Design a binder for this molecule. Structure first.
Ligand SMILES: Cc1ncnc2nc[nH]c12
Ligand SMILES: Cc1ncnc2nc[nH]c12
Ligand SMILES: Cc1ncnc2nc[nH]c12
Ligand SMILES: Cc1ncnc2nc[nH]c12
Ligand SMILES: Cc1ncnc2nc[nH]c12
Ligand SMILES: Cc1ncnc2nc[nH]c12
Lengths: 237, 237, 237, 237, 237, 237
């Protein structure tokens, strides 16, 4: 057991999907995992382990923010033998052509945070995902007939940022989506030798100002989850 | 209802106690509040509103890290008329003379986060608590015969910091406790026009390594909650 | 004798009031101290030690700017056993509701100086005053029927700042007064193990431009000195 | 015609291969392209356009350092309609498990340069390559029986860096190779909406300097060019 | 009259020598100027105007630190028609070969301060003296048979710096002397269109740890002053 | 022989002239030096040694950007005993009173590069030329009836800077010319104990782009070389 996870080695699979919302983890466990057992509830950060098409898989919330997901992923990698982490969340759109229900894969992640600079002698550390995991995700989305956009995400420390001019910048440099963990998770993965990937569905559009709500929205969220789950299956083969 | 809180203007008191852990907010509602009523459960961030010796009070977790509490404190302040936020949590100590279970009042909060620099044109913004709130807490503590140090806290972005030596710097400058929120909450308070104070219980020494133990946790934690609740009363008078 | 103070251990009281202007230190010695004795004149930075209602007190100018007062406060603390430093000066206001002659207590001090970043590994060090000293001053002020705001000051390196807009940022974050020392004095206090507090008289509005006028200066200045001197008494009791 | 490219729109292909040394550009043109025609001589930075298996392609040296290649890549993107830039060169390794002559694909590029911060409001921009180009290169390498590693490169501003401890950091964070352009080219591509990729062959090892014959170097360099060239064909399919 | 100088246009010469110590200004006025009249005493910062070999010359203290000298030089340049400022002070040695009684001329000045970054969009502004003034100084020293070293000075914000490793750095890059104003004065000169120069005599040796005291020491200080005075005479011709 | 210079100690003179474009190096050698012998061909960066009025002198292109010239200047200083480096090239002007073909001597060089901060503990290093070399160049220019301006140059990392407002800043602070190497060469020279100078001729004007005939350009370029060459002779005297 670690400070934020009350479980023991073996309780988690070597791969863990991680949404920001713990309630979302329970939703993933019951919707896609068979024989899912809760392996953690500390601070209400629900974690589950089960199987997908016979493969052992875990899913657990990481809370909101780089500081939050950093603790959890680190504890998973160094104390529970987790070798892969796939964040599955929502991001805000900045690019006009990126429509809602578009699955976004963060090959890289820009950031507002100072954590990677702390780690990298105040230089620029390019926070990137594991290449194979990105490829597995793209191929899985393909097999499912889903159009995935691979590019840069932006991990912000302030969901309510005082600088709105930054969004024009993110747009100029092609940032595909804005969220709050990717850069943090990739920094932890590189620091402790594991692999990570972040997948997002666009729920908000800071461009055309139009969030999402319909059966269609929830269908895209599940597609993302399937992409994540199927991508690990391809990784095993 | 805001993006992370499903409640309506009026569901919250004008003062809100906030621990990091949502499960603690619940325990506080059940232990110190009468007519406890759950006003939010989005993302499992349990929020309660009740009464303490006649005063309307609210208690809701804020999650871990500056990005997490910044979201909640902001939404409470701008959409629920919350005037005062009182963070009640745990912190690690760096000063040898600061022993476990000690109660620390964060008059100020240092940080390695970039949030305030982003707000303050990259200059040094002194993240400070509201003076009256600090004084109220100091007084409530004396009335309860409890010792309470007043000074600087350090809000870290990385619980698992790769910069060990920074703790020597914290010690040299008198940091009373190491946590992960104060500086963010104080930043938001100044930005959105509210008042805040962070009270922390010394859960361990970053040096010695002695995580919370036995039933000591409850007494001290209850003392902190007692100090914060009473301080709110002295504040009204 | 230190490099900038020709005095000997014992020439100074354990508490020292310090205005920026050396000529003010003299006026204070003559006006409020009995048995006033000049203990330093190096670089014309007049220093005095006398008695106030029986208490041994010292008053010496610290010059203008963080680099200047850092030198003096440091030498007093490390070579003359000075335990408490109380800066008593003037400040420009940025908040419309803060009017001229207002008395401000710097609980905290923001700055655009790099001194604290150099001390704090380039992180954010919250330059704060000693809590008891702030409280003593707030009380001394009430006993004198004087209004005194408590909050953040901004210590600027450039009196003639080429960044006008920064004042809007100061206003937005509630800076009560703009001066040029607080943050440095608080930094030195933490570094060398002493206590400090900065009290300022609002000499004008950075906006309106209304430099000190008539005999109002003397009354208010004397009120500030009265508040600082009395605060030292409440401190001993 | 631009400040450093004396040619007209159409003279270059929509895809440009760029070696560090200009001499290599002429070699590439006469060794792998057919019907090559010179298109630029300014500053001795030779430029060539021709075909590889029917595909129109251009090659030209980009010089050493982020500033040099930023000039050329920018002009090609905005004035000659270039859509893809592939830098082909050498790099030094810091990882023991990375051998000389190993082919490294830079999915991302870290850097100690300020060009990206100046572009990104002083935040962390993750300088990444175009994902499809990365996979094309990996698949082309596989088809040619060549082993290819994908990950981070480090673009140094100083070949003779005053800091030797930084190499330990690079190793700790998995940097595959050290060179001097990638982060700059990726920044430029992002700024002007184009795609870029950097492929390097491990020339030396900052570790234990091994040894390679001019013959072995020849083979490796041609493998890198074929990879690059075949990757372009895969991209078209 | 300006906020820190109680004088009127004409009271100062268009050239002003400035030592840090106001008492030193009086020493210069009486030792080298004929018919010297005090033109300022605000805050005890003595200023004088007289003639040297028939030329109108002024001398005035600037206090200690960039923040201090910035105010004074700015007020002199923009309100008293001063076109030239020559700081004449003392500096600490860092280079072994730079002996005591060596006259140092700061063609440039490095710094710890953030003031020039505030002015220069956070970039590197090379704080330099006016070339002609440097040349006049070198020629004047020559005519007097004095060996002047021209190079870089280092303007520190902290006379008592917490980082001693910086001195090795200053030494590695050939900094000839350490003081506290040059960089500030050069920033003001460039900002308001005037010319400045800083001349120093080495009084302390942070290398061999040996200050200076003798008739010889005071002879070198006067040589520096003569150099400054004679250099302006050459400037007029 | 070094990584970028295939020559041996003695092949170069203790003084090296460096133009941006390598083609210019061959021109300088056959137009102003006698008995010239090639000493380097690596990467097409031609090197030559010979004599000018009996004085041994070398010339070789340094490429574009701080990173490029830093490599070459460092190797020449540490491996070929070079004592003086004179960069001769062009620059863009931002000051209206600075006309095309004007000769500019860089006593100092500002920059937006991080190389000097990385070298100087993140402080402001004033990248300055060797004073004697500056005066030699000014005197040589005078002797040749050429007008020469002395002051700051700005070494940009990005020829195509995203910020256009910075040019206003440069103008406000008197920058005489914009180029891309000076600050880097001065940094290197300071690091390895050598002397450097940068001389530029105003090629274009970021203001109103005027016009110059290839003939006028020829004349101006030769004037700059003579200046440089004659300045070396003056330095020897
Ligand atoms: C609109 C917005 N801004 C910042 N971070 C976000 N994550 C999701 N949506 C976001
Ligand atoms: C090491 C550390 N960092 C931040 N918050 C903490 N609480 C307890 N220990 C902590
Ligand atoms: C503009 C300004 N800056 C710093 N200190 C001051 N006191 C009065 N006005 C001031
Ligand atoms: C140390 C270093 N820096 C930059 N590029 C390189 N290629 C090989 N070694 C290198
Ligand atoms: C020793 C020392 N350190 C820092 N600044 C100084 N000015 C003069 N002497 C000095
Ligand atoms: C804009 C710019 N940047 C860098 N070097 C230059 N030479 C001429 N113009 C230039």
């Amino acid at each position: 057991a670690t400070p934020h996870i009350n479980a023991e080695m073996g309780d988690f699979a070597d791969v863990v999907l991680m949404p920001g919302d713990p309630l979302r983890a329970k939703y993933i466990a019951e919707t896609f995992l068979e024989d899912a057992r809760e392996v953690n509830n500390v601070r209400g950060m629900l974690g589950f382990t089960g199987t997908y098409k016979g493969r052992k898989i875990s899913v657990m919330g990481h809370g909101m923010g780089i500081p939050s997901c950093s603790i959890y992923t680190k504890e998973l990698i160094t104390d529970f033998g987790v070798k892969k982490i796939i964040r599955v969340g929502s991001c805000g759109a900045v690019l006009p052509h990126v429509k809602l229900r578009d699955v976004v894969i963060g090959m890289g992640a820009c950031t507002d945070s100072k954590v990677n600079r702390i780690r990298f002698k105040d230089h620029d550390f390019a926070a990137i995902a594991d290449f194979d995991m990105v490829r597995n995700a793209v191929d899985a989305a393909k097999a499912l007939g889903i159009d995935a956009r691979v590019g840069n995400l932006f991990s912000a420390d302030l969901f309510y940022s005082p600088d709105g001019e930054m969004f024009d910048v993110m747009e100029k440099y092609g940032i595909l989506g804005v969220e709050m963990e990717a850069a943090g998770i990739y920094g932890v993965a590189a620091e402790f030798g594991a692999k990570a990937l972040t997948i997002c569905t666009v729920s908000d559009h800071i461009r055309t100002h139009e969030q999402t709500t319909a059966a269609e929205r929830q269908t895209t969220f599940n597609d993302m989850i399937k992409i994540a789950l199927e991508s690990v299956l391809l990784g095993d083969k």
